[PDB]
């Protein structure tokens, strides 16, 4: 599984836990376009979902404020996702990787539960986070993959 696949599966899974029973069309589309091969009910996804939820709960206010300033100040959502990714990943710690994945999953949850959010905002955000996250593939590969990182290590 690539980072983009695991992130998208975590977002899908999180929507099933928090939402109204309808997957956002944007998540359906990214599943179609990615070829998502990983099930959101796969045990590695449930385990990461626990870890990312703990990080969110522990950073709940800072996640809300950072998301709120990002989203209210961007004129090009998908480009700016790639900019914050660079700011964090410069050089690559496990904590930093998870902070970014939890922040993305938290942003997706916020976008998808607000029925007033315009489609294009949800769309460009989910595309931006998925594309930016690909920058983690080289590093996670040198750790033997996401499954190995969680089952293990």
């Amino acid at each position: 599984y690539s980072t983009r696949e695991i992130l998208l599966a975590l977002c899908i899974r999180d929507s099933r836990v928090h939402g109204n029973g309808t997957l956002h069309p944007v998540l359906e589309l990214a599943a179609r376009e990615t070829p998502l091969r990983l099930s959101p009910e796969d045990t590695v996804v449930l385990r990461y979902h626990v870890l990312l939820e703990e990080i969110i709960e522990r950073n709940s206010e800072t996640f809300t404020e950072t998301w709120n300033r990002f989203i209210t100040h961007t004129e090009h959502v998908d480009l700016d996702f790639n900019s914050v990714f660079l700011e964090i990943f410069h050089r690559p710690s496990l904590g930093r990787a998870l902070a970014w994945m939890a922040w993305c999953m938290h942003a997706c949850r916020t976008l998808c539960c607000n029925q007033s959010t315009p489609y294009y905002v949800v769309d460009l955000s989910v595309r931006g986070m998925l594309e930016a996250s690909e920058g983690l593939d080289g590093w996670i590969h040198q750790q033997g993959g996401w499954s190995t990182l969680i089952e293990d290590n």
């Binding site: 990002f70 900019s83 700011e87 964090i88 710690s93 904590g95 902070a99």
Partner: peptide, 23 residues
Amino acid sequence: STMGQVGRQLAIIGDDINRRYDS
């Protein structure tokens, strides 16, 4: 640079997570 600041705030949290996992 709101993108700068969001980045740095997330980086701080990344560092906190590492120490957290060490205990």
